[PDB]
Scaffold this active site. Structure first.
Site, PDB file in Angstrom:
ATOM      1  N   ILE A 182       1.185  -1.044  -0.198  1.00 26.55           N
ATOM      2  CA  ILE A 182      -0.097  -0.256  -0.064  1.00 26.55           C
ATOM      3  C   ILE A 182       0.787   1.262   0.074  1.00 26.55           C
ATOM      4  CG2 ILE A 182      -1.391   1.119   1.208  1.00 26.55           C
ATOM      5  CD1 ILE A 182      -3.023  -1.588   1.996  1.00 26.55           C
TER       6      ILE A 182
ATOM      7  N   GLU B 293       1.616  -6.788  15.536  1.00 22.11           N
ATOM      8  CA  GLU B 293       2.109  -7.336  16.860  1.00 22.11           C
ATOM      9  C   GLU B 293       1.898  -7.243  18.049  1.00 22.11           C
ATOM     10  OE1 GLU B 293       6.628  -6.599  17.258  1.00 22.11           O
ATOM     11  OE2 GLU B 293       6.671  -8.270  15.433  1.00 22.11           O
TER      12      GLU B 293
HETATM   13  O1  LIG Z   1       2.890   2.427   3.766  1.00 27.46           O
HETATM   14  C1  LIG Z   1       2.857   1.297   4.544  1.00 27.46           C
HETATM   15  C2  LIG Z   1       3.147   0.846   5.805  1.00 27.46           C
HETATM   16  C3  LIG Z   1       3.310   0.172   5.690  1.00 27.46           C
HETATM   17  N1  LIG Z   1       2.313  -1.495   4.795  1.00 27.46           N
HETATM   18  C4  LIG Z   1       2.107  -3.027   4.912  1.00 27.46           C
HETATM   19  O2  LIG Z   1       2.798  -3.249   5.970  1.00 27.46           O
HETATM   20  C5  LIG Z   1       3.503  -4.049   6.490  1.00 27.46           C
HETATM   21  C6  LIG Z   1       3.874  -3.567   8.266  1.00 27.46           C
HETATM   22  O3  LIG Z   1       4.563  -2.453   8.146  1.00 27.46           O
HETATM   23  P1  LIG Z   1       5.872  -2.174   8.407  1.00 27.46           P
HETATM   24  O4  LIG Z   1       6.739  -2.069   9.258  1.00 27.46           O
HETATM   25  O5  LIG Z   1       6.987  -3.227   6.803  1.00 27.46           O
HETATM   26  O6  LIG Z   1       6.423  -0.728   7.511  1.00 27.46           O
HETATM   27  C7  LIG Z   1       4.861  -3.902   5.433  1.00 27.46           C
HETATM   28  O7  LIG Z   1       5.217  -4.800   5.523  1.00 27.46           O
HETATM   29  C8  LIG Z   1       3.423  -4.180   4.234  1.00 27.46           C
HETATM   30  O8  LIG Z   1       3.195  -5.016   3.938  1.00 27.46           O
HETATM   31  C9  LIG Z   1       2.275  -1.243   3.202  1.00 27.46           C
HETATM   32  O9  LIG Z   1       2.179  -1.734   2.923  1.00 27.46           O
HETATM   33  N2  LIG Z   1       2.410   0.096   3.196  1.00 27.46           N
END
Ligand SMILES: O=c1ccn([C@@H]2O[C@H](COP(=O)(O)O)[C@@H](O)[C@H]2O)c(=O)[nH]1
Ligand SMILES: O=c1ccn([C@@H]2O[C@H](COP(=O)(O)O)[C@@H](O)[C@H]2O)c(=O)[nH]1
Ligand SMILES: [Mn+2]
Ligand SMILES: [Mn+2]
EC number: 2.4.1.40
Lengths: 293, 293
Positions: free
Chosen positions: A62, A242
């Site tokens: 996203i 988490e």
């Molecule tokens: O702007 C964003 C923030 C998070 N995520 C999704 O949420 C997961 C968890 O966030 P993060 O800790 O990896 O940033 C990411 O790996 C991704 O799959 C997105 O796709 N876009």
């Protein structure tokens, strides 16, 4: 009903030899802890292929995180459940930005358009709601197991049917050697994710969990409902989804636990001797920048 | 559906400390091998009591073996599944010789009258047919799990819900340290129980196996059907029902394996260091005399 395995030639298990001398390979509730050396993948592949097992893999991409999909999916093609039926579910606010990755036979990809929340914390947390919703939309009729992972990652080595079980969590790579007091559970009693200092088995990572569709729908619905209670009470758990996952898996023990081979960050943690394989690893990243417009 | 466990205080699992350094605690297909030190019985008791688990225990006491029932049942009352619902099923040709043993609350005993075969080998082997038949007569509606044991035994220590799983076998106490070539599997290809010299995981004892009712009915029906094929072909497997059980569990891997703590003979084998507990043991016996008129 399970048909009989064919004749197979392989080394005899050694009753009087531990398969690992350096790590715990079973939890106190008799769930295997999956490390290299604990399993014969040839036996497991037979068992699961004789059930024509289909594995769904969910990933959220996203906003700027669409950039991570190409490597994620390419490397999943090399290492994730090869030989088995796979259905990727890419949840995104930008369907047109999903890369065209070539898939092996028996593997398919669906793009699921979802809304983008402004804060990375909400993007991360609302995965529970979105996975739960699609358990009815699709998953129950399409896959046997669901595997739910972060996208900012790559596969470097085998991730296969040894993980499959009704309910699994993964040891977070920052805490597998830590005492429970040091685990970063939610510690405020006002939150539904609260875990006291004298409780906890492990610190599980929100970036890799899964199970049967039924157990994953239960987990995701419970975590979403708990996050909605917290929101109504004006509290957001310290580590978001988490924290809620850890509360759930304390109260509902997983039937397998994956070692940190399955969730690693080599930049931050190196390649310790206790990791014989580094299977699924963080991609280098600029957190602030990529989580922000 | 599984309700949440209550808060519990217990020692944290130690990820970087093996729970046993001297034995294999998980099979290569990721089934726990149940030894003392591998499980926290308080967690397991909670899990199984929150499902109001009922365990059936089958035992055959035919001809002179009625003499073993009193000690068998008394000691089961002390050590088998205490705190859980238990249904004993005593199969006998002499209902009037079943001793009146006092049972704890939530525990019941049924006497099932069956015919007596002349040869001990047929008595032993026809347990598969008889257990299979009663899976419809009673077991599916009365119990969640079945545990199927020899009667010429006594409980000396805890045998509880740590054993329960869809399908389990037990390491035979005479072979747990042996190489597969030395296992006394049936080695004649003319028998349905045949296992080649380069195949086999373990040598399981016919005296202690079990699982869910569905899996036990499958096992017992398959073994009876295989013994009927052999009979029509004029062959009787070298170790009777045990040979067929080993063939079945080679082809259909058990989801837990019990250590020889659960099936032992102290007269013949002593008390080795690798056995922290001796749970279910042979009674001294005169084989010829007691198997004969
Ligand atoms: O702007 C964003 C923030 C998070 N995520 C999704 O949420 C997961 C968890 O966030 P993060 O800790 O990896 O940033 C990411 O790996 C991704 O799959 C997105 O796709 N876009
Ligand atoms: O005359 C006999 C022979 C065998 N058995 C049953 O079959 C089991 C297996 O036989 P054995 O090897 O213990 O003699 C016994 O423990 C007992 O439950 C009898 O009841 N009566
Ligand atoms: Mn991430
Ligand atoms: Mn016996």
């Amino acid at each position: 009903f399970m048909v009989s395995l064919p004749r197979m030639v392989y080394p005899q298990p050694k009753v009087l030899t531990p398969c690992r001398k350096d790590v715990l390979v079973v939890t106190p509730w008799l769930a295997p802890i999956v490390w290299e050396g604990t399993f014969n993948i040839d036996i497991l592949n037979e068992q699961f292929r004789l059930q024509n097992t289909t594995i769904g893999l969910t990933v959220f991409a996203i906003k700027k995180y669409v950039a991570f999909l190409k490597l994620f999916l390419e490397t999943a093609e090399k290492h994730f459940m090869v030989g088995h039926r796979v259905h990727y579910y890419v949840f995104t606010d930008q369907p047109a930005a999903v890369p065209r990755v070539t898939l092996g036979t028996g593997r398919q990809l669906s793009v699921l358009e979802v809304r983008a929340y402004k804060r990375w914390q909400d993007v991360s947390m609302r995965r529970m709601e979105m996975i739960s919703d699609f358990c009815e939309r699709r998953f129950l009729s399409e896959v046997d197991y669901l595997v739910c992972v972060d996208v900012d990652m790559e596969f470097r080595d085998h991730v296969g049917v040894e993980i499959l079980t009704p309910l699994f969590g993964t040891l977070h790579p920052g805490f597998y050697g830590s005492s429970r007091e040091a685990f970063t559970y939610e510690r405020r009693p006002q939150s539904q994710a609260y875990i006291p200092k004298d409780e906890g088995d492990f610190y599980y990572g929100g970036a890799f969990f899964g199970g049967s569709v039924q157990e994953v729908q239960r987990l995701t619905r419970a975590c979403h409902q708990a996050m909605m209670v917290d929101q109504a009470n004006g509290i957001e758990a310290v580590w978001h989804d988490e924290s809620h996952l850890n509360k759930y898996l304390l109260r509902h023990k997983p039937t397998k636990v994956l070692s940190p081979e399955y969730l690693w960050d080599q930049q931050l943690l190196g390649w310790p001797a206790v990791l014989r394989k580094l299977r699924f690893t963080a991609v280098p990243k600029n957190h602030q920048a990529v989580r922000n417009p």
